[model samples]
Every structure is written in structure tokens, then in C-alpha cells.
Target: STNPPPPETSNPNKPKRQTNQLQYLLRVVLKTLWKHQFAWPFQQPVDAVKLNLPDYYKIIKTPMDMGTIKKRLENNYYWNAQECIQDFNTMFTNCYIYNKPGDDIVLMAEALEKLFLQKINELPT
Candidate 1:
């Protein structure tokens, strides 16, 4: 009687739904971020020459925005929540690197970052 049946807990079966759920939640988060007013400034890549910030590419090596994020999401470029999070984080980081604290775009970036963090935190494990 010493030996007992193996518990299902020890099974190594993959939880397929976990992956699906994470992607689903990530999509939801992106959709919501896109709808926010603050998202306007981040909807597309920064136009260096157009904005007369020719050095933008030099300062912001990693440029990110809603359009690219959305495109990547649609193209299955993200494999996990962490990947998506990185791009979102980069989007904000780029803003901080190139814009002054009091700049309007910086304010928008702050608001978007706050909202992004709140949404991502609610994702389930």
C-alpha cells in the first residue's frame, strides 16, 4: 500500500489554452491602447525629416508605435506576452529618450504607459 497512483499534477501535458489566452489578452490590450486619445502620437513611426528632428533615429534606435505593434500582432510576430510587453515598453522608452519631460508627446507617452501597465497587470497566469 506504500505505492499510490500518480497524481495528474505531475503530468507534463502542454496547456495549449494558456498560449491562446495570452495572445487573446494581448490583442485586447492593444485594441484598448489604440482607442485611447494619448495613442494618437504613437499611432505611427516618428517622421524624422518631416518633424525636422533629423537626429531622431540617432537618439531613438528602437522606434515603436501602435501601427507597427498592430501590424506585428496581426502577423504573429509575437510569441508570448513578454515579447508584446517589450515593444510596448520600447514605445514608451523611445518617447522618453527623444522628448523633453514637459513636451505634449511626452505627456501622451506617460498616459499611454500608465494605461498599458494597468492592462498588462490584469493578464492572468
Candidate 2:
């Protein structure tokens, strides 16, 4: 016959669980993007459009690991103008890509600068 294992007890001195630096940074980025939801324009009506709250959640919550972000955004429809604005405002503010400590921020900054320039050039002259 095998002997039963003894019951385990929690260690009071153990350190409390803490979020990783990357996770914290990502959260901050998400919050910032969330504040810019007002910028999202009303979505056009289409079979792919997702307007309902349930659909919105499903689309937004879809796993980014599967490359569904763009697809979800494409399907999101804005039934309520006010909600759309708020949602868009929040979306931009909260969107952020967390990187490792050694990752190069300069690269991202340069890319963003170029993108801004391109966008400016695209504006009606």
C-alpha cells in the first residue's frame, strides 16, 4: 500500500503576485488607446459589420495571436454615434505593443514618424 501525501500549507512569507513590466506597460498603452475611442467614425453597413454588443465583444476579444485584429475591426459597425466615438477614442489610446527591455524604441519612433509623414502627404492639398 502507498502512503498518502501530507497536506500542504500556504506560506505567509511568500511575496505577493506582481505583474510583469511588459504586462504593466501593455496595460498602460491599452488604457491610453481606450481614451481615444471618440476618433472612430461610424462604420458602414455590410454583411461583415458587427454592431451588437455581443458581436462587438466577440470581435474585439478575438485572439490577436491568430491575426484576427484587422478582421474584427473591419466587421465592427457603429450603431450609436456617441458610443462609436467613445469606443474609437479609447481604442487608439489603449493600443500599444509591449516590447522587451532591450527592444529598440527608436525604430518604432522612426517608423511612426514616417507613417505620419505619409499620412500628411495623403491629405488633400
Candidate 3:
């Protein structure tokens, strides 16, 4: 060790706007998906697993139980990339934990991309 650790390029000591925007984006996406796909932490699924996920309807509750959804469900939730990533990963892991080599999961992440483009071609643009 020299006189002291060399000064860093950017100060982690100060907060950056990019950081804030990233945090906000993460929160919005999480809330949006939960609201659109999941059942408001007030509902379930009998055969959602067939859709590549156990129907986040039943699957998202784990994180929601302790995540921003739960947090914001009551107003405590706020933008936070770290918690967003953690909670999102948890939701996705549970959602597709058992997706097979050739399952609906592939449909959403793969085939859907191409199909989506194909559909877009039909637009009047």
C-alpha cells in the first residue's frame, strides 16, 4: 500500500442522476408488470405453468410479500434498482423455474420476437 488508495475516477460518495433515473425506471417497470400480469397479490393459478410461468398470478407473491409491490401496495415502495433487480429475479425464477427445453418460456423470449416483427410489418407504416 502506498500513501493512500488512489482516488477513484468518479466519487461513489455522491449520487448521480443516471442512478436516480435507473432507479425510477426499475420501479415503474416492476409496478407495471405486476399490475398487468400478476393478480395484485390477491389472487392464483391452476395451470399457469403451461404459459412458461406458473402464471405470475401465483408465482409473484413470494417477492410481493416482501418486495416493493408489498411496500408500494401501501405507499412505502420507491424507486430502487437494487431491490427492483432482486425482486424481479425472484419473481422470474419462480415464474419459469420449471420451463422445459421446448416450452412457453421460449415462446415469450424467442419465437415471440420474430412473430412480433412479422406482425409489425402488417402495420400501415
Candidate 4:
């Protein structure tokens, strides 16, 4: 008879492992995003009063920032990778909507979005 391999002992679908893996990948992505040159404006939530854009809140119903996203990760607020990605998209989308076409911030967000998309695809499921 042909020799057979021992039965596999590892659990491929371990819930805890999968969750932690997702968090790890997300952390790496956030770290990379923060290091980008165009990441300064997105580092914190917009200051409406200081910027003198009183209607900012009215236009952007949900304001997102890199700091908030980082806090969410620290607090384990994301149930899945998609939820975390959604927040990133929200931050970028906010930039696109509030800024005029071809604006510097808009261009920055677009560049970051492209970078993130590439990085996201490289992450394991």
C-alpha cells in the first residue's frame, strides 16, 4: 500500500486567528497611509470653527479622519475588514465631496485611495 500523510491537525477556519489577522493587516495599511506625504490633512477631523467653514457640518453628514479610524482599530470597533475599509472610503469620499474638482486635497485623497486599493488587494482574506 502507498504511504499516506498524517491527518492535518491545524484548523483552517479558526475565528480568533482570522479576526486578529485582519486587524494586523489593517494596522499595516493604516501605518503606511499615515506615512504618506499627503496624509497631513486627513490626520485629524476637520475643524469647522477654526477653518471658518460653518456649513461644513451641514454638507458632510459624517466626518471621518485617520485619527478616528486609528482609535476605532485600537478599540476593536471593526467587526470585519469591510467595516474598517468603509471608514477609510468615507474619509476619502468626504474629501472628494467637500473639495472643488482638481483641488489639492482632492488630488491627495485620490492618490491615497489608489495606494490603499493596491495595498488592500495584497492583503490575505
Q: Which candidate is the best by lDDT?
A: 4
Comparing 1 and 4 on lDDT, the stronger one: 4
TM-score of 2: 0.21
Could you give candidate 4's per-residue lDDT for residues 69-100 as a string of tens digits? 77666656655787678889999998888889
- The digit string of per-residue lDDT tens for model 1 on 1-125 reads 12222112222342222366357644678888899977887888776666777677777766777777776666555557676678888889989988898999898889888888788878876
Lowest summed-lDDT stretch of 10 residues in model 2?
62-71
Error of 4 at 99 (Å): 1.0
How many pairs collide in each candidate, listed in order? 0, 21, 0, 0
Which candidate, 1 or 3, would have the higher TM-score against the true structure? 1
Using Cα atoms with residue i matched to residue i, what is each candidate's TM-score against the true structure?
0.79, 0.21, 0.34, 0.81
Of the candidates numbered 1 and 3, which has the greater lDDT value?
1
TM-score of 4: 0.81
Candidate 2, residue 21: CA error in Å?
Answer: 36
The Cα RMSD in angstroms, rounded to one decimal, for candidate 4 relative to the true structure is 15.7
**Residue 44 of model 3: what lDDT?**
25
Q: Which wins on TM-score, candidate 2 or candidate 4?
A: 4
Which segments of model 1 are wrong by more than 4 Å?
1-18
Better of 3 and 4 by lDDT: 4
- Compared with the true structure, all predictions reach lDDT values of 0.71, 0.29, 0.38, 0.75
Candidate 3 residue-wise lDDT, 89-122, digit = tens: 4544553554455665544423323432343334
